[PDB]
Design a protein around this ligand. Structure first.
Ligand code: HEM
Ligand code: HEM
Ligand SMILES: CCCCCCCCO[C@@H]1O[C@H](CO)[C@@H](O)[C@H](O)[C@H]1O
Ligand SMILES: CCCCCCCCO[C@@H]1O[C@H](CO)[C@@H](O)[C@H](O)[C@H]1O
Ligand SMILES: CCCCCCCCO[C@@H]1O[C@H](CO)[C@@H](O)[C@H](O)[C@H]1O
Ligand SMILES: CC(=O)N[C@@H]1[C@@H](O)[C@H](O)[C@@H](CO)O[C@H]1O
Ligand SMILES: CC(=O)N[C@@H]1[C@@H](O)[C@H](O)[C@@H](CO)O[C@H]1O
Ligand SMILES: CC(=O)N[C@@H]1[C@@H](O)[C@H](O)[C@@H](CO)O[C@H]1O
Ligand SMILES: CC(=O)N[C@@H]1[C@@H](O)[C@H](O)[C@@H](CO)O[C@H]1O
Ligand SMILES: CC(=O)N[C@@H]1[C@@H](O)[C@H](O)[C@@H](CO)O[C@H]1O
Ligand SMILES: CC(=O)N[C@@H]1[C@@H](O)[C@H](O)[C@@H](CO)O[C@H]1O
Ligand SMILES: CC(=O)N[C@@H]1[C@@H](O)[C@H](O)[C@@H](CO)O[C@H]1O
Ligand SMILES: CC(=O)N[C@@H]1[C@@H](O)[C@H](O)[C@@H](CO)O[C@H]1O
Ligand SMILES: CCCOc1ccc(CC(=O)O)cc1Cl
Ligand SMILES: CCCOc1ccc(CC(=O)O)cc1Cl
Lengths: 551, 551
């Protein structure tokens, strides 16, 4: 059999086929040597034996508030943040490596941004089993697997107090870089840009952008409804939007991310950010009476890109992490480091971010309780209630726990089933192999994975070997940290993808991170002091309860 | 008047318009402060008062051969190459900054690779004069300027011994990253890739590449003639090639760069590299019998990119510099440095690279002497003589001196005329402003620029002021170093663009610079030991005199 099917090469070593049946591991710069890159160098050895486990660090970071407050007020905050940023980031290859067509480095893979990249090469097509060498010749029925371990029975709230405001931000935010192409197939994205470029607000292509712009004062087109500002209709902004046949254009809003009409939650943020852009335009014009529409537009976009990163690191991730350490967004922390300011979305990162357990059984707005059939394509909810009302509602309703299993509402369970099926098409390597790729020891049994016995026994019977457990199912079934939203894998595997994506942005480079880039001191401060509360309230008639945490 | 027309900000400070008539300079990280970034910080002052002049370092590098022979044999060689690589590179913005549409940082300028980038922004369209503030309301007639100062009268050979083998290499090589879009206009390129991607061999788009590929053994299509290997015909590889109307497809050669059929010298190199790609494929298959066509092709491509960068630094640039220091291509030299492995072609680099003075009065091949009329669209010379014969001839014929003036053959003088006109459309800033941006003191007069008085006087009368002198004319009229091919500006401005262009390629990054990237140790050595002599002679029946220097 093909030797690489055994994943012989350890610690990021590269398996290459030589001759008709041999293989070799390129252990270059892995910190190890030997046939499979297992013989540790002196510093490699010290580092791995002195490194406390993920569980222990997580414990340190969620205990001793008093000590953390003291630390957050010192330069240590800067030391630890830079540490998190660099260590977390070094786990992501930059420039990118493989894609769905090349399980090896190639010029096509480096230049062709229509491909998602991947961290581990696919499971070779000629391996004994679908997962490589372990498990059964046939994987568990995707739908049965989902109905048995992911379907929600009783709604489980997130112990960390995460609300729907956070849940919709996450969806809205990620859909600017997760845009799998239906015509091209799995492993392909339309989200060229591969990151926080705000394409979900300005469009992922120029012509779409243009149809969305006013071309006056650098602003975005809009319409007034009830004396409030909302994205324009597809009639004033002839842009492709995905709405069910039978809905008139005069009821379809145009936003840049064609799929946003599918949820009031998504169109809410589309509205909020649109209002913020035009607001920033007004501020720039006061400072620069000589500027034209283009410069105003471009500069506001850079500012909004900055605000988003600021808000994602300091509030979004802060809420997710649960850390007592006050995370900080400051590009300077990396100026003395070796870091590439480029980013490429990975298919694994896409899989990992399918956080459907967050959605509730129904959507409570005031005393009214809306069902999925009343929420999904409602093109009038947003305008009926307005921004303040929905923000207050979503900020008050608790979202579901992500990890732990059995927590995805039946209405959207089909999404999980399809993620599992796509994983097999993409031939994603086993969960334990990804565990290793991110610094963890593989699980030695299902009972070790879940913190229990019943599910474990049933998973063991279906998969046959813990080494056959798949990527996505692994993330969602792994036991959660104490009172956390998900397990360690989600953190240890997602932190690297996230942070590299936030800081590996051109505006974070020494060349771009200057006040001139944002129109001056005033534009720069909008980025440096951006807040979820200001994003909403500086754009609404009244200020509601706004937060990523339930009250 | 627009205050920025005075180019008030120094040392890379960014001029920004504020209010109705004010301006401010963003001196962030320039090493200076004050309204125009002219008040140095203590260290900035030490560094600039200790830095010897460009003419001095040039001197130290072109003297004391004895001394350099020991240096090149020790780690000092590396220490210096790194020093050159980093200091030269830091003068090039990365990520890129402005483009023909935006004289300011923008997401569109960063994401849109159809635009050439630019180092200095354009002269604001609302300035008193075309160059900003100095000179006459109208610039000298491009053709007049060309006839008077760039037209050849008597062939001036390159004192450094450069031959036509070098000239044609330079043309072949650069036309892979210099491909101005006729349909889109100046400031636009079709050579996405922006660097050494070998698109002039494989094509600048996938479909062209697919039409050029054999899809067997990862090889490129070809045809046999006189028992020799040449590029296929357009009838066998249906690709758009620019040939005079009337030449049927059966008689065209398909190569990657549509414009190459227009010169035997160009198609010569197209032939050599084609034979090299297919040769490398053979070596690869021997090593990896289990590989398919895709991986053989891709890996072969990466190896050629490496060879190209290798030969360009160690032989090409060595020839140009005339340094006693032996330049070295070793990506590891920057592994400890802060370097961005990306590159974006600048319009200035395009202009600067117009080295038409290199071309002779005619092309001698054996006892025969061909004229431009016989050379330019000759569709049989390459095959009539074959690779070896032409290489021998081109390696023996001297090329013209680039700098000094009056040395462009009348047959191609029109390129220079249009180059100057494009410059005014691109609104390139004055030569002196570029001298500064690249670390040199501006010229205080035309007599200082030229090393004489005759041309200096005529130039002064035409331009009126030294500060009105345009980019390209400045480069070609500047007094040349002793027995050099061109002036110091050509080096001080070209070096940063070149070196950044060579090392700012993903294959030179830690993630790619591994043996596995090139199919193993064998592939990695083809790159590490690449040579002009080997590039020719390992793909020809006999080995002729091959070199960038005349015998
Ligand atoms: C009303 C609740 C939601 C519904 C109805 C929904 C529906 C969908 C659907 C239909 C797809 C494509 C499915 C397919 O092709 O089979 C999808 C993809 C996805 N969803 Fe959701 N989703 C919801 C909430 C969320 C949330 C809260 C997140 C968390 C960030 C999320 C993240 C994703 C991601 C990352 C993808 C894949 C992106 C891509 O490749 O284009 N979804 N969702
Ligand atoms: C018989 C010899 C040559 C001929 C007939 C020739 C002809 C041309 C022509 C017709 C153009 C485009 C002119 C226009 O649009 O007005 C051009 C552009 C150019 N040539 Fe040459 N050339 C020759 C040799 C060279 C050499 C030796 C070099 C040095 C590397 C060179 C570098 C360039 C560059 C950099 C451009 C601009 C590229 C672009 O923007 O696409 N040329 N040449
Ligand atoms: C001074 C401290 C010494 C600690 C001893 C560590 C020894 C590491 O030993 C290594 O373990 C790997 C996994 O079992 C093997 O694959 C390697 O071949 C082996 O050398
Ligand atoms: C208490 C101080 C905490 C500093 C934060 C360290 C940054 C997080 O570091 C992470 O630790 C994990 C556990 O060992 C590793 O598996 C990850 O690869 C590493 O990036
Ligand atoms: C003998 C030691 C040689 C060291 C090589 C230095 C690399 C060349 O360095 C160059 O020097 C010029 C003159 O000061 C500067 O104007 C350029 O910006 C700089 O890149
Ligand atoms: C030194 C060492 O670790 N050798 C192992 C070998 O015994 C094993 O069969 C192979 C495939 O996993 O990987 C390697
Ligand atoms: C996923 C995808 O779009 N595949 C395309 C294929 O359909 C097309 O024929 C070929 C030629 O360009 O390029 C690739
Ligand atoms: C892929 C892309 O968006 N490229 C655009 C191009 O379409 C547009 O014509 C040009 C001029 O602004 O700028 C760039
Ligand atoms: C006024 C009101 O309650 N809002 C309606 C809701 O009842 C309905 O189910 C939904 C989809 O038709 O559109 C909205
Ligand atoms: C402190 C200082 O240097 N100020 C100068 C000013 O006098 C000059 O007129 C202007 C235009 O170059 O640039 C600045
Ligand atoms: C030089 C160029 O290509 N400009 C085009 C312009 O003609 C087109 O209308 C616009 C919209 O895509 O994009 C840009
Ligand atoms: C711009 C570009 O070249 N994109 C290509 C696309 O054309 C091709 O169909 C696909 C699959 O090979 O890979 C990518
Ligand atoms: C056989 C021979 O002499 N070579 C000819 C040359 O004379 C002619 O000028 C050129 C283009 O017409 O094509 C070739
Ligand atoms: C996809 C979700 C991203 O989640 C995270 C990103 C970063 C950190 C902080 C760290 O430990 O480095 C924590 C979490 Cl949970
Ligand atoms: C214009 C073409 C490029 O020319 C050069 C590039 C690099 C170097 C070496 C150095 O940095 O000094 C010298 C020359 Cl002439």
């Amino acid at each position: 059999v093909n030797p690489c099917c055994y994943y012989p090469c350890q610690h990021q070593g590269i398996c290459v086929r030589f001759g008709l049946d041999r293989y070799q591991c390129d252990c270059t710069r892995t910190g190890y040597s030997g046939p499979n890159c297992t013989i540790p160098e002196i510093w490699t050895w010290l580092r791995t034996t002195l490194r406390p486990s993920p569980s222990f660090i997580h414990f340190l970071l969620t205990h001793g508030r008093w000590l953390w407050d003291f630390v957050n007020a010192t330069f240590i905050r800067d030391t630890l943040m830079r540490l998190v940023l660099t260590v977390r980031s070094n786990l992501i290859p930059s420039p990118p490596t493989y894609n769905i067509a090349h399980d090896y480095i190639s010029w096509e893979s480096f230049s062709n941004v229509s491909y998602y990249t991947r961290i581990l090469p696919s499971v070779p097509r000629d391996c004994p089993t679908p997962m490589g060498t372990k498990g059964k010749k046939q994987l568990p029925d995707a739908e049965f697997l989902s109905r048995r371990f992911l379907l929600r029975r009783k709604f489980i709230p997130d112990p960390q107090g995460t609300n729907l405001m956070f849940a919709f931000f996450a969806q809205h935010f990620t859909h600017q870089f997760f845009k799998t192409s239906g015509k091209m197939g799995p492993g392909f994205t339309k989200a060229l840009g591969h990151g926080v470029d705000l394409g979900h607000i300005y469009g992922d292509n120029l012509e779409r952008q243009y149809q969305l712009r006013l071309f006056k004062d650098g602003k975005l087109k809009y319409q007034m409804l009830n004396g409030e500002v909302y994205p324009p209709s597809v009639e004033e902004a002839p842009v492709l939007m995905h709405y069910p046949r039978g809905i008139p254009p005069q009821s379809q809003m145009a936003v840049g991310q064609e799929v946003f009409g599918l949820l009031p939650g998504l169109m809410l943020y589309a509205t909020i950010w649109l209002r913020e852009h035009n607001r920033v335009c007004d501020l720039l014009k006061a400072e620069h009476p000589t500027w034209g529409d283009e410069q105003l537009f471009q500069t506001a976009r850079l500012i909004l890109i900055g605000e988003t990163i600021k808000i994602v690191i300091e509030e979004y991730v802060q809420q997710l992490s649960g850390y007592f350490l006050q995370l900080k967004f400051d590009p300077e922390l990396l100026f003395g480091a070796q870091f590439q300011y480029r980013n490429r979305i990975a298919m694994e990162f896409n899989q990992l971010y399918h956080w459907h357990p967050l959605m509730p059984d129904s959507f409570r707005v005031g005393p009214q309780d809306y069902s999925y059939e009343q929420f999904l394509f409602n093109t009038s909810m947003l305008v009926d209630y307005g921004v303040e009302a929905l923000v207050d509602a979503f900020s008050r309703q608790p979202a579901g726990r992500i990890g732990g299993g059995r927590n995805i509402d039946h209405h959207i369970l089909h999404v999980a089933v399809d993620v599992i099926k796509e994983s097999r098409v993409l031939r994603l390597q086993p969960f334990n192999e990804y565990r290793k790729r991110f610094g963890m020891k593989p699980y030695t049994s299902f009972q070790e994975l879940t913190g229990e016995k019943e599910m474990a026994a049933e998973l063991e019977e279906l998969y046959g070997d813990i080494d056959a457990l798949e990527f996505y199912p692994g993330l969602l079934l792994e036991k959660c940290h104490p009172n956390s939203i998900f397990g360690e894998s989600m953190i240890e595997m997602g932190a690297p993808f996230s942070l590299k994506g936030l800081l590996g942005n051109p505006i974070c480079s020494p060349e771009y991170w200057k006040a001139s880039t944002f129109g001056g001191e005033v534009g720069f401060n909008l980025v440096k002091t951006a807040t979820l509360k200001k994003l909403v309230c500086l754009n609404t008639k009244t200020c509601p309860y706004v937060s990523f945490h339930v009250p």
